[PDB]
Symmetry: D3
Subunit: 180 residues, 6 copies
């Protein structure tokens, strides 16, 4: 009786959006493998194994039914007790925006917590996190593509309100451009 289909297009962003949204995990916490979602098939592909001896600091993925200036969905880093599998989805609250420039191109990402993790669900601002946790995250993105000669600048994190604007705008943009 039901659809069975493509996580970008066919997974609702969720009724709590943009504050709380569904989020499809591409990469697990601790992974050296950079999975990404194949836009055409909706399968998970290995984009690459990472060039440095680094691992993703948290579960990482994208928000369905979003679109950015790069023609990709909006990416999210999700803090929570446990590692989660590629291809699963979860409910996440935005707590900040991590502004970045990836090879001279804007690529801001959301930092968030899982809304169904009983430890992490009560966070609302990244300022509430331990400052090291930010320094670690910021570093990861600075460093993860260094051995591919790709420069990534990371600025200071911006507040929840700002993140929510980005999500909201990417929802709008998906709905505008996806039809054609």
């Amino acid at each position: 009786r039901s659809v069975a289909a493509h996580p970008w297009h066919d997974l609702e962003i969720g009724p709590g959006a943009p504050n709380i949204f569904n989020c499809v995990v591409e990469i697990t916490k601790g992974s050296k493998v950079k999975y990404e979602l194949d836009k055409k098939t909706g399968m998970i592909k290995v984009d690459r194994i990472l060039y440095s001896s680094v691992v993703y600091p948290h579960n990482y993925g994208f928000i369905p039914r979003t679109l950015c200036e790069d023609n990709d969905p909006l990416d999210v880093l999700v803090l929570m007790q446990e590692p989660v599998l590629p291809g699963c989805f979860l409910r996440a609250r935005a707590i900040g925006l991590m502004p970045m420039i990836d090879q001279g191109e804007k690529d801001d990402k959301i930092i968030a917590v899982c809304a169904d993790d009983p430890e992490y669900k009560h966070y609302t601002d990244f300022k509430e996190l331990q400052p090291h946790r930010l320094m670690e995250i910021k570093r990861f993105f600075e460093d993860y593509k260094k051995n591919e000669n790709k420069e990534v600048a990371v600025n200071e994190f911006l507040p929840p309100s700002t993140a929510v604007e980005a999500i909201q705008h990417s929802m709008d943009l998906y709905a505008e451009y996806i039809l054609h």
Copy 2:
């Protein structure tokens, strides 16, 4: 040339049912993450991280093309040598029924063994298992939702014949109610 589709609806229960059936794994042995199947998309979602420091004692999941009084498929706990991934399916023989009341509502589940695990496939009754293994399982369900203030009573396990009745009835019920 083939379908590619929703594990509840589009996976046959299998020609050996109700004695031996297909079974879609939602949660791995040792997992603190409570995955479940999204009824609408057929994706795996994180329902929650568990509130206690407990882990699932075996691979856990549901039987496709079943339905119970709760509008959900019939759940199964699957004993076998190895942990199995969420979203995979396997062949399992019923060896008992574990009667439960979850917050004042009936929620009986099947206890089973993987029919293609060369160690576990020869079990036929849960009485054949070590009594501790039952005590552990029974405990897990008593304890796993305690920190959410949800009470779960677990009674003595009932035999294979009884489990098979439940599976059979849930097959029938799926076929009756799923059309409309």
Copy 3:
């Protein structure tokens, strides 16, 4: 806006084929679980837990849009730094063909490296690998089904050119026979 569908049929073999091809992983490096792809649903199933205390020496899987005399796609063993999940796909370069007879029936398989692993991507011939790595692999296939009374003979590995012929031929065969 996109398909969302069956990895055998709906995943392109890729524009680099037959030299570099997409490859759907069924089994992870180190796994005792023998997953395989369900031809009908495109789900991953447990075919079996292995009968010996052996584990797969590398990520293992099949090439989409291939077909062999056995009515199955062509299988691949993929060397790379990291374990990869069942159901994901990756890009792989052929470096040899591993000729086998599985219970009196031909069942040649490809040996390959991940084209997006920055260590392994520069290999082009299996002769470039350490001879032990071959001896280990060869052994695995000789030994993995022994406890099921299934005899598997493995001959000396043949070069890249030969592997590429097999892939090419299986592409052709898929296109010939899949229509009807």
Copy 4:
């Protein structure tokens, strides 16, 4: 020097009782109840746990301590990473967890690793998320249930009280080392 029996021959550390060395018996997420053998100083499997439960954090004991139960003072250690049995690390106390193990008092220390850059800046159990405490409480309440042993756990007390209990257990250990002469 020669090889060390960890209970006796590992210094508690310069910053004691506030910040102390700590020997890890059990890893975060383990179902194996390792403990350190009193006689050999090796690691022993005391038992595999009777429930489908796991230690919520790295667990062990403070060396050169002693309690009325004749064992060293136990510690739970919050930190980013799981740690091996047999290793020691530096830990700050941030609270004490009063318990009753079958009528016998068996208080434990809740602590953070002092060399873990995230966790080192915590100083009070109240700084942690309330769920973290709820989960730990429940773990001790539940982990021995299938052995038919009751364990009651009361409200956690501040670091000032923890430091006292640690000091008192250093005194007892010493008092015992004197009674060796």
Copy 5:
């Protein structure tokens, strides 16, 4: 006490020869052939296994035992959980596995952990599923094949025979400790 060389300074235990302490060299699922260094008593990587195989259970040896091969009596230990190298645990013997390692007899003990609530109630290898035995047999038959070493494995014998072999190896160890004087 001081730190212990596990072979010599770890007691075999009060319940020997039926129930004995046992030092774990290799974890369930490991491809690393750890063994305990005779001289230092540390854990050494003897080798990484030559085939894509893994130890089907936790593996090690009984302390204060000795066999004609000049090594302690080896044990395979069935239990719910994997255990670390260097740890010891309590184990009941439930059978003996006769083998021939390149013409030399090298019998091993099959056992269960006595402190594991599931496995502790097994007393005979015949109580285990026949496949479990088939798999173990094959492991020893196959794990050294890529080193060109033949290992033959015969039908497993009952616990009465296992206990004898254990006793006999305690005698040899003792007989050797006498020949130290």
Copy 6:
């Protein structure tokens, strides 16, 4: 014998300086900076790493060696499998990695396990894939960055130079053991 402090009481081995025993402090893929405690000879958590990085290979030190930094000579060990902290193994040197850790020279050895059937036949770092070297170089360049410590790493030098550095560090260790008298 009795239990061994691994730095002092573990022989470097018959094949030194070319092939040497080697004590593992840190497992491949670990974020925990274990090191061996100088005084107790136990394993200590020095710290949890400040970046989201992991050791690209098993890491440790050569026993009975000493460098100007007052620590033993460090080794990175390439092999099929991860290895536990506290274990030792046999390793061939195949290159040396010159570094500067905050103005201080802190050269390390790059090596393979000699008992690992795949890796044992490597004899020069140039036989490894260039990316492997790029990754290792970067690891040391980056792993202490969030502690505000600069580490410069220069081009790797051949095994002849590695063997010299090893020999020189055996001399220093010895020279120090003489200065004990």
